[PDB]
Structure formats: structure tokens, C-alpha cells
Amino acid sequence: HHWGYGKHNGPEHWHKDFPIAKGERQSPVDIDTHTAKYDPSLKPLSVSYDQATSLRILNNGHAFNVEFDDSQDKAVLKGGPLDGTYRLIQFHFHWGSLDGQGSEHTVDKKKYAAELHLVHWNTKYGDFGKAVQQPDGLAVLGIFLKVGSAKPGLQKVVDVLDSIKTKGKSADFTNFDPRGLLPESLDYWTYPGSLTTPPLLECVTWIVLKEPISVSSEQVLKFRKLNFNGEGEPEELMVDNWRPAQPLKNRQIKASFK
Ligand SMILES: [Hg+2]
Ligand SMILES: [Zn+2]
């Protein structure tokens, strides 16, 4: 029926409705740190989130998205391997049922507890919908989360989850600062890829940060209390909403560091 992460509608079934699932630049991928090419020409990343405007948080049935006002250049990403300005439209997470899994990208086969995706679209294309029709239409910042100390800047998100337990529910979520989720260093790996959930469009320039942020056991625990299902339906815990690593094929992963 509709895609999901269960045994009957999970990642291994996606190709039937979305043939691109077996494409040439699918994500996520395993990052082999020993064959990644240090590219000294890669410029530093420029994250300008000081004027970001969060608007709402929403349980969409596969994750929860925090949406931002992208009608103007308020929170943008540029620099790095990018040409042009990309606007932040939303961020979400992928997590596991256990601390030993949850991330989509892996480093030398290592899986993290979760992975944060900050989705941006290339402004030269006018809107998000037009951006998804271009090979350089999107830029996604991937940040790994490991279990340890609590992340202060993440608590506001955790506290509001109670209000959006089921699919379709949303809540106002203004004045949230995404800078509170960034690690200290901006060193990264980058390769050409795709969205990790259907439609799985190959329009993404992935920028995966080398340094993960840490969150407490109690913080990721609240993520696991969300439901894939809508209100009044049989409860299905929202856990393991991640896609397995895909073949790298004819692609080179470049590192901004050495
Ligand atoms: Hg595309
Ligand atoms: Zn994602």
C-alpha cells in the first residue's frame, strides 16, 4: 500500500512504486574514511541561521518536521561545495529503536543513534518544487547524534513532542534557533546523492559533518514515543525510520579535511 518502514512496505519494497530507488546516485551511503579524497579546493561552509524563523512542528507519519519561513533569505547555507544560496525549509531526524542504530549514513560501517537533516533548496530555482527538478536543486546538512550528555538546545523540541504524537497533528513552534544543534567543527564529507524517502529524487548535494553532537538517553527516548499512525488507529511506535546504505557506484566522496 503506502510506503513506510515496516516488513511489508519498507525500503526493500520502495523500488516497485519509485523505480529511481535503484538509481545511480542514491542515498544514504557508507562513508569509507580511507578512500574519501581530501579536496584542498573545497571552501569552508557558511551557515547563516541568525535570522531563522521557525513556524511549526508537524508529525507527517514518517518523522516530525520543524518548518521555517523560506519566503526570504533568512536562514541560508552557502560555501563548501556549493554554488549559490540555499534556503532552509525544514529539519527532521531519523532514529532507531535502540541506541546502536538510527543514522542513515554510516562512517566506516559505524551506525549512530540518530541523524539530523537540515534541508535547503537552491534559490535560483524560485521554489522548492522547482528545485526538486534539478541535479543541484537541494543541499542537505547531515549531523550524527550519539548518546551521552544532553543537548540543551534540543530540549524545546523534545518537550513539544507530546502535542504531536500522531500522524497529521501539528503545533505552533516559533522562535526556535537551529544554531543550538550544530557541532563545534564544520569539517565535512560531500558527495552527490538523493532524498532518502520517496520520491527519492536525485537532486541532493550531501554535506555530512564529521563531528557528531551528543544527546541524552532520555532525549532520544522521547523521540521513540511518537506514532507512525493517526489518532484512533492501532498504535505503531515511530522507530527505525531510516534507510539502509546504498551502493556508491560511480561516485567519489570528498573530504574537506585531512
Ligand atoms: Hg533532481
Ligand atoms: Zn532525512
- For 1-258, CATH number out of 3.40.190.10, 3.40.50.720, 3.40.50.1970, 3.10.200.10 equals 3.10.200.10
103 CA distance to ligand 2 centroid (A)? 9
To what resolution in angstroms was this structure determined? 2.0
Q: Has 2 been labeled as part of a binding site?
A: no
Q: Has 92 been labeled as part of a binding site?
A: yes
Beta carbons within 8 Å of 231's beta carbon, 6+ residues apart: 166, 167, 168, 169
What was the experiment behind these coordinates?
X-ray
Question: Between the CA of residue 57 and those of 4, 174, 182, 229, 234, what are the distances in Å?
Answer: 20, 9, 19, 17, 23
Q: Is 62 a catalytic residue?
A: yes
Q: What DSSP string runs through the chain?
A: ----SSTTTSTTTGGGT-GGGG-SS-S--EE-TTTSEE-TTPPPEEEE-TT--EEEEEE-SSSEEEEE--SSSSSEEEETT--S-EEEEEEEEEE-SSTT---SSEETTB--SEEEEEEEEEGGGSSHHHHTTSTTSEEEEEEEEEESS--GGGHHHHHHGGGG-SBT-EEE--S--GGGG--S---EEEEEE--SSTT--S-EEEEEESSPEEE-HHHHHHHTT-BSSBTTS---B-----PPP----S---EES--
184 CA distance to ligand 1 centroid (A)? 31
Q: Which residues are paired to 171 by β-bridges?
A: 57
- Estimate to the nearest angstrom the gap between the alpha carbon of 195 and the chain centroid: 9
| First-to-last C-alpha distance (Å) of the chain | 46
Q: Where are the domains of the chain?
A: 1-258
Q: Has 196 been labeled as part of a binding site?
A: yes
